RNA sequence: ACGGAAGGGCACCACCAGGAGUGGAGCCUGCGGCUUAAUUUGACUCAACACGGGGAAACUCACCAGGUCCAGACACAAUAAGGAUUGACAGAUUGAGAGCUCUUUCUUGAUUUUGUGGGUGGUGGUGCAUGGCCGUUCUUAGUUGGUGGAGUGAUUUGUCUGCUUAAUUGCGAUAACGAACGAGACCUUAACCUACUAAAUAGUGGUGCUAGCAUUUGCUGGUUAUCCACUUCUUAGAGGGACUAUCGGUUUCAAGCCGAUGGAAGUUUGAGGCAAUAACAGGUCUGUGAUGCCCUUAGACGUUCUGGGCCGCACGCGCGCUACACUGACGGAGCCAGCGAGUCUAACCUUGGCCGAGAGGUCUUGGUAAUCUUGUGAAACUCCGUCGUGCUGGGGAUAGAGCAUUGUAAUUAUUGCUCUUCAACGAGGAAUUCCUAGUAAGCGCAAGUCAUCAGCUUGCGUUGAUUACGUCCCUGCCCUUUGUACACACC
C-alpha cells in the first residue's frame, strides 16, 4: 500500500504551490531542495515528500492538477 | 517482646546515638549489623518505640527504616539518665 | 567489586529503583519528584528533586542528615562515601509524579473529584504544558467501581514521541472506603525541549518565499 | 619534577550512548589537545541484556510474551602519558551515568 | 444497543491449491473422573486444559498425620521485690540431643505474666467491594473539535454512492472548508557502504623465526610481541541510501495498481516496539508491605519443626515426544552456525594432562570476558561400507541386575552409565490445528527454570520444498440499510 499519507500529499502540494521557480522532475534535486527549504524531522519522510512532489511535478508538466 | 535489659541497653544506646536505624525483614538472623543483638530484638523493640510515638517507621524492599522523633529524644534521654541537651544526630558533625 | 559490568550496570539500576522507591515513600509530604545517583571521586552524590527543600533540609540540616545516615547504613557505605543534595524542581507542573501526589493529597482533603482533577489539569495547562489528561479509576462513595477521564489540550499516544514527550504517573490513593487509582499524564511542549528532538516527526514546516521585482534589462556593477 | 611515561588504558562504560560518546570523543580530542601518543576509542561489541517475560500477572489469557532489553556500551582508550595529565584527565571529564576506570597495566 | 432483517466487504485465528500434520499407536505432560488421611488451588468455546512463567524429593506449600514458638504494639487494671517472670542437666517421655509435658529445684529479676480494650499476622473469603496489571473485542479503523449549512430541539452535515489501499489509506463526487487524537510519521532490528573515524580484546598483507613436502622460484603450517603497514573481511560511532525510481501498460489518464529495467533491497524493504475513544461484572486479593469489608488470632486459618501429599489409577479430553523404516537403521569417516551465559566476599563458565568401557574421577588452567570455556569441531547433513524387506539389525515401551552424579535426604525408582528383557505401532475412522519464501517442514543449540531434573518454553541459527498470488462455498468479524415497546441496552 504505497498510498502516500495526507501530510505527505499536503506538503508536496504546498511546495509545488509556492516553489515552482525551482524544482524539476528529478528526485535528487527535489530532495536536496526539500532540505534547503523545509524542516522535515525525518530523512524517510522528506524523501517521501520529495518523490511525491516529484510525481506531481512531472504530472503538472503535461496538464494541470486539482488543488 | 522478651529480652534481657542488656540488649535493651545496646539497642537504645545505639539509637539515641546514631539517631537512625535500619533492619531487614529477616528474623532467625542470629545477629545484627553494628548492634550486638538478635535482629528480632531490634525489630520488635523498634515496634515498641514506634507505637508509643517515639520513632518513625518505614519499609520498602524488605528493610525497616527507622527514623527517630523529638519525643523519642525526650524518652531516650529519660531512658539513658543523661542531661537535657545530650547527644543525638542533631550536630553538624565535622564540617560536612 | 571485581564484578562483571553486566551485573554492575544491572545492580546500579536496581539500586536506583530501590532509591527512588524509598525517597518516594519517605518524602511524599514534601512533593518529592525523583533522584539521580552520581559516581564521583571522594563521594557519591544522590540528588533529590522535591518541591519543599526548605523542610526536606530539616531543622538546620537535621533531617537530610537522618536520610543520608539511613541510606548509608542500609547500602553499606563508609561515612562520607555518599552525600545527598536537595535542589528544587523547575516547574513542578511538568513532572507527572508531582501532580499525581498532588491530586492524591487533594483527595486526602475530601475535595470534589471533579474539582481536584479539573484544578490539577488547569494548573498543568497554566504551567505551559502542551497537554494533560488525568484518569481516575476505582470505587468512590458508591459501591460498583467507576472511572473518570480528564483531558485538556494536545497529546499523542503512539510511537517514539511517547518516550520523548509525555509523562505517565500512577499513584494509588488509599481511603477509608477502598482504593483509587490516580493516573496522571502530561504532554510537555516540544518547541521548548532544550535537549532532544524539538518538534513532532509530523511537523513539516514550509518557509514562505518573497516577492521579486524582475524586468529592467541586465546590466552589471564594477567593484 | 614528577612526570614520567606511563602506559594507560582508560575504559568508559555505560548505557546512554549520547553521553558515552560525548565523554569519549571529548576525552580523545582533549587528550589530543596536546600532541599526546595514543590508541583512540576502541568500540566493544554492544552488549544486549534481555529479559523474556509473561505480560500477565497471573496465568489466564493468550500467551503474550514481553521482551525487555538494556544496552551496555564499552569503549577503551589507550594513552601514553605522565602522572599529572592523568590525574587531570580523571578529575575532569566526569559524567553522571558514565562509568570511567583508569588502569596502568604494562605486563 | 440488539435482531434467528436486507446488501456489501475483510481474513490462512476463513475457504481455495497444496504442504507438514493432528485425530489411530507407546510414552511425556496438563484437565476431568475416580481414589485418597491429604491427593492444596485458580482457569472451562475462540479468549480454560506444555496456562498461573506451575520442570513440587526438603523447602516451595496453599493439603494431610503430628510437635513447638509468639515474632499478641500500645492504654487501663490486676499479680507481685517475702519475688511479676525465663531457662535447664538427667530421667519419664517424644520422630527427634523440644525441659512440649512431668519428676526433683537450681536459676532469672520486672525484660514478662493474667485480664480488658486495642492491635497484628493470615497462599483464609469476597477479582461480584477495589487499585494496579493483563487478556479480548482488534489479524480492527475508529474518535473529535473550529468557522460554516439543515433542525425549536436532542442531533445532523463534515465523518459520503463509487473507486483505491493494510488503513476514515487515498482519489473523487460533494454544503461543506480546513484540521487534532488514532493509522501514517516515529522507534528497534536484519539488509547495502574497497566512501569517513579506527582497533595485541577484531582481522589482513609483508617480514624477522621455523617445520613439512618440494627442492627451479614453490606449495602447506607453526611463532597472544620481532618489527612494519593496511582496515577489504569483524566490530560500532557519525553520515549516505529507496522516494515502489526509470520506462511503460491498466483504470473516471485520479488515487493507484500491473509489467519490464536497474538496484543491498521495490508484499507497510523483511520482522517487531509503541498505539485512540469505548467495552467485559474476562483473569489476577495464590506477585506485591496495593487494598475495602468479612472471617480467623494462642487447641491460630499466625509462623516453625518431623513425616506424607500434590506424581496417588477401571476410564474421557487437550499440547505434545518417539515411531512404524531401504529419500532407512547401524558403523566408520568427512565437517559448518547463530542467539546466549558465566566466580566476592566464591566455587560460576571449565580448556589442558592422566585414571576409567561408559558414566564419571583426579591434578592443574584461562576467564568477572570480543581477551577464557569457544571456532560452543551442535545435529540434521555429505562421503565408504554393513544390513536387505522378514513386527527385520525398524521401533524402544515394559522390566531385571550392576556402576556413577546432585543433594542432609533419591524407597513411590531426580539424572547419567553398561548388560539383558525386544511390547503396541504395517501411514491410521469420522473428524481437526498451523502455514504463502529462506516461509513450511526437517535439524540442533543457547537461554529461562535449575542443587540435582526438558519430552516445555523464549530466542537463535543449520538443510530447505510443494501450492495461491484468487474467491465469498463453510467459519468468524466489520460496514451501511432496517425494525424496535430495549437504554442496567437480548444475560
Rg (CA), chain C: 24
**DSSP assignment string, B15-78:** HHHHS-EEEES--S----SSS-S-HHHHHHHHHHHHHTTSEEEE-STTEEEEEE-HHHHHHHHH
Q: Three-state DSSP class for D49?
A: strand
> Could you give the C-alpha distances from A4 to A43, A47, B43, B89, C158, in angstroms and in order?
15, 11, 67, 69, 19
Decide if B65 and C26 are in contact by the 8 Å CB cutoff: yes
Dmax (CA) for chain C in angstroms is: 90
Instruction: State the nearest Cα–Cα gap between A48 and chain C, in angstroms.
Output: 12
Task: Specify the experimental method.
Answer: X-ray
Distance A6 CA to E16 C1' (A): 37
B95 chain-C contacts, CB cut-off 8 A: none
C-beta of residue D75 within 8 angstroms of C-beta of residue D20: yes
Contact criterion met (CB below 8 Å) for C171 and C158: no
CB atoms within 10 A of CB C110: 8
Torsion, Cα A36 A37 A42 A47, to 10 degrees, reads -80
Beta strand D6-14 pairing with D37-43 = unpaired
Which residues contact residue C208 at a Cβ distance below 8 angstroms, ignoring those fewer than 6 apart?
Answer: A18
Helix (H, G, I), strand (E, B) or coil at D24: helix
CB B69 within 8 A of CB C63: no
CB contact under 8 A, A15 and C203: no
Residue D81: φ, ψ to 5°? -155, 155
- What's the CA gap between B33 and B10, in Å, rounded? 12
Q: Show residues of chain C in contact with A38, CB under 8 Å.
A: 204-207
Q: Angle at which helices B5-18 and B39-51 pack, to 10 degrees?
A: 70
DSSP letter for D35, please: T
Nearest-CA neighbor of C195 among D22, A44, D75?
D22
Nucleotides of chain E touched by protein CB (<7 A): 42-43, 47-48, 51-53, 70-75, 85-86, 109-113, 129-136, 164-167, 169-173, 179-187, 197-201, 235-238, 240-246, 254-257, 268-269, 273-279, 281-293, 339-344, 368-370, 448, 457-459
Report the C-alpha gap between A27 and A36 in whole angstroms: 14
CB atoms under 10 Å from CB of D23, counted, come to: 19
φ and ψ of D33, to 5 deg: -60, -25
C21 contacts chain B (CB < 8 A): yes
Neighbours of chain C (3+ CB pairs under 8 A): A, B, D
- Strand C82-86 versus strand C44-48 pairing type: parallel
Compute the distance between CA of residue B89 and CA of residue C21 in angstroms, rounded to an integer: 24
How many angstroms is C1' of E488 away from CA of C87? Answer: 53
- Compute the CA torsion angle C107, C110, C115, C119 (nearest 10 deg): -50
**Inter-chain touch C69–B92, beta carbons under 8 Å:** no
Q: How far apart are CA B48 and CA B44, in angstroms?
A: 6
Could you tell me how many residues make up chain B? 96
Element of type H or E holding D70 = strand D65-81
CA D32 to chain centre: 18
Spell out the long-range contacts of C188-191 with Cβ–Cβ below 8 A and sequence spacing 24 or more.
C188/C94, C188/C129, C188/C130, C189/C128, C189/C129, C189/C130, C190/C130, C190/C161, C190/C165
State chain A's maximal CA–CA distance in angstroms: 32
Cα(C34)–Cα(C23) distance, rounded to whole angstroms? 8
Instruction: Please spell the DSSP secondary structure of chain A, one letter per residue.
Output: -----HHHHHHHHHHHHH--SS--S-HHHHHHHHHTTEEES-HHHHHHHHHHHHHHHHHHSSS----
Chain centroid offset of residue A47 CA: 9
The CA-atom distances, in angstroms, between C41 and each of A24, C70, C217 are 60, 22, 73
Spatial distance between the Cα atoms of B73 and D102, rounded to a whole number of angstroms: 47
CA C205 distance to own-chain centroid: 29
The Cα B19–Cα C66 span in angstroms is: 7
> Residue D12: closest CA among chain C residues belongs to which residue?
C5
Determine how β-strand C179-187 pairs with β-strand D37-43.
unpaired
- For residues C51 and C31, give the distance between their C-alpha atoms in angstroms, rounded to a whole number: 5
Q: How far apart are CA B14 and CA A58, in angstroms?
A: 86
Chains C and A touch, using 3 or more CB pairs below 8 Å: yes
- Tell me if residue C162 falls in helix, strand or coil: helix
Partnered with residue D103 across adjacent β-strands are D9
| Residue B4: how many other CB atoms lie within 10 Å | 10
C1' of E283 to CA of D54 (Å): 14
Inter-residue contact C32 to B74 (CB < 8 Å):
no
Relative to beta strand C44-48, strand C35-39 is antiparallel
- SS3 assignment, position A59: helix
Largest CA distance in chain B: 41
Q: How far apart are CA C10 and CA D42, in angstroms?
A: 23
Label residue C62 left, alpha or beta by phi (over 0 means left) and psi (-120 to 50 means alpha). alpha
Start-to-end C-alpha separation, chain A: 23
Q: A11 by DSSP, 3-state: which?
A: helix
Chain B touches chain D, with at least 3 Cβ pairs below 8 Å, answer no
Residue numbers of C between 179 and 218 with CB closer than 8 Å to A: 197, 199-209
Three-state secondary structure along B60-93?
Answer: CCCEEEEEECHHHHHHHHHHCCCCCCCCCCCCCC
Q: CA D89, CA C219: separation in Å to the nearest integer? A: 62
3-state secondary structure chain C: CCCCHHHHHHHHHHHHHHHHHHHHHHCHHHCCCCEEEEECCCCEEEEECCCCHHHHCCHHHCHHHHHHHHHHHHHCCCCCCEEEEECCCCCHHHCHHHHHHHHHHHHCCCCCHHHHHHHHHHHHHHCCCCEEEEEEEECCCCCCCEEEEEEEECCCCCCCHHHHCEEEEEEEEECCCCEEEEEEEEECCCCCCCCCCCCCCCCEEECCCCCCCCCCCCCCCCC
* Closest protein CA to C1' of nucleotide E246, residue: A26
Query: How far in angstroms lies nucleotide E71's C1' from the CA of residue B27?
Result: 8
- The backbone torsions φ and ψ at residue C168, rounded to the nearest 5 degrees and listed phi first, read -125, 110
The CA–C1' separation of D63 and E426, in angstroms, is 40
Tell me the C-alpha distance between C126 and C117, whole Å. Answer: 14
The DSSP call for residue C165 is T
CB atoms within 10 A of CB B93: 10
D84 touches D6 (CB < 8 A): no
DSSP C49: -
Round to whole Å and give the CA distance between C151 and C184: 10
Residues of C whose CB is below 8 A from D70: 9-10, 13
Q: Residues of A with CB below 8 A from C197's CB?
A: 41
B20 closest CB neighbour out of C66, C80, C83 = C66
Give the minimum alpha-carbon distance from D17 to chain C in angstroms, rounded to a whole number.
14
Going along chain A from its start, the domains and CATH numbers come out as 6-61 (1.10.60.20)
Report d(CA D50, CA C144) in Å as an integer. 41
- Residues pairing with D53 in the sheet: D66
Amino acid at each position: 500500500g504505497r498510498v502516500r499519507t495526507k501530510t505527505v500529499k499536503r506538503a508536496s502540494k504546498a511546495l509545488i504551490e509556492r516553489y515552482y521557480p525551482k524544482l524539476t522532475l528529478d528526485f535528487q534535486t527535489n530532495k536536496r531542495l526539500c532540505d534547503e527549504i523545509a524542516t522535515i524531522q525525518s530523512k524517510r519522510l522528506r524523501n517521501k515528500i520529495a518523490g511525491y512532489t516529484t510525481h506531481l511535478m512531472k504530472r503538472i508538466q503535461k496538464g494541470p492538477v486539482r488543488g | 517482646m522478651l529480652m534481657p535489659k542488656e540488649d535493651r541497653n545496646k539497642i537504645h544506646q545505639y539509637l539515641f546515638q546514631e539517631g537512625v536505624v535500619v533492619a531487614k525483614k529477616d528474623f532467625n538472623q542470629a545477629k545484627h549489623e553494628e548492634i550486638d543483638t538478635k535482629n528480632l530484638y531490634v525489630i520488635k523493640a523498634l515496634q515498641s518505640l514506634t507505637s508509643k510515638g517515639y520513632v518513625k517507621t518505614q519499609f520498602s524492599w524488605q528493610y525497616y527504616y527507622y527514623t527517630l522523633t523529638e519525643e523519642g529524644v525526650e524518652y531516650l534521654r529519660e531512658y539513658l539518665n543523661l542531661p537535657x541537651x545530650x547527644x543525638x544526630x542533631x550536630x553538624x558533625x565535622x564540617x560536612x | 567489586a571485581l564484578i562483571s559490568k553486566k551485573r554492575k550496570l544491572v545492580a546500579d539500576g536496581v539500586f536506583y529503583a530501590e532509591l527512588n522507591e524509598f525517597f518516594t515513600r519517605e518524602l511524599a509530604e514534601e512533593g518529592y519528584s525523583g533522584v539521580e545517583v552520581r559516581v564521583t571521586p571522594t563521594k557519591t552524590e544522590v540528588i533529590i528533586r522535591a518541591t519543599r527543600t526548605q523542610d526536606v533540609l530539616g531543622e538546620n540540616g537535621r533531617r537530610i542528615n537522618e536520610l543520608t545516615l539511613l541510606v548509608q547504613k542500609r547500602f553499606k557505605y563508609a561515612p562520607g562515601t555518599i552525600v545527598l543534595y536537595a535542589e528544587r524542581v523547575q516547574d513542578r507542573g511538568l513532572s507527572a509524579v508531582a501532580q499525581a501526589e498532588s491530586m492524591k493529597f487533594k483527595l486526602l482533603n475530601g475535595l470534589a473529584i471533579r474539582r481536584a482533577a479539573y484544578g490539577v489539569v488547569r494548573y498543568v495547562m497554566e504551567s505551559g504544558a502542551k497537554g494533560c489528561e488525568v484518569v481516575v479509576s476505582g470505587k468512590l462513595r458508591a459501591a460498583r467501581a467507576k472511572a473518570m477521564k480528564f483531558a485538556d489540550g494536545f497529546l499523542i499516544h503512539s510511537g517514539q514521541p511517547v518516550n520523548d514527550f509525555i509523562d505517565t504517573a500512577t499513584r494509588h490513593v488509599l481511603m477509608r472506603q477502598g482504593v483509587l487509582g490516580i493516573k496522571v499524564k502530561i504532554m510537555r511542549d516540544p518547541a521548548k525541549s532544550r535537549t532532544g528532538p524539538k518538534a513532532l516527526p509530523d511537523a513539516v514546516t514550509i518557509i514562505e518565499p518573497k516577492e521579486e521585482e524582475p524586468i529592467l534589462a541586465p546590466s552589471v556593477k564594477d567593484y | 619534577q614528577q612526570q614520567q611515561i606511563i602506559k594507560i588504558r582508560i575504559t568508559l562504560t555505560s548505557t546512554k550512548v549520547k553521553q558515552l560518546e560525548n565523554v569519549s570523543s571529548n576525552i580523545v580530542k582533549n587528550a589530543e589537545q596536546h600532541n599526546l601518543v595514543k590508541k583512540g576509542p576502541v568500540r566493544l561489541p554492544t552488549k544486549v541484556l534481555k529479559i523474556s517475560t509473561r505480560k500477565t500477572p497471573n496465568g489466564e489469557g493468550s500467551k503474550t510474551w514481553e521482551t525487555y532489553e538494556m544496552r551496555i556500551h564499552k569503549r577503551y582508550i589507550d594513552l601514553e602519558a605522565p602522572v599529572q595529565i592523568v590525574k587531570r584527565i580523571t578529575q575532569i571529564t566526569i559524567e553522571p551515568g558514565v562509568d570511567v576506570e583508569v588502569v596502568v597495566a604494562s605486563n
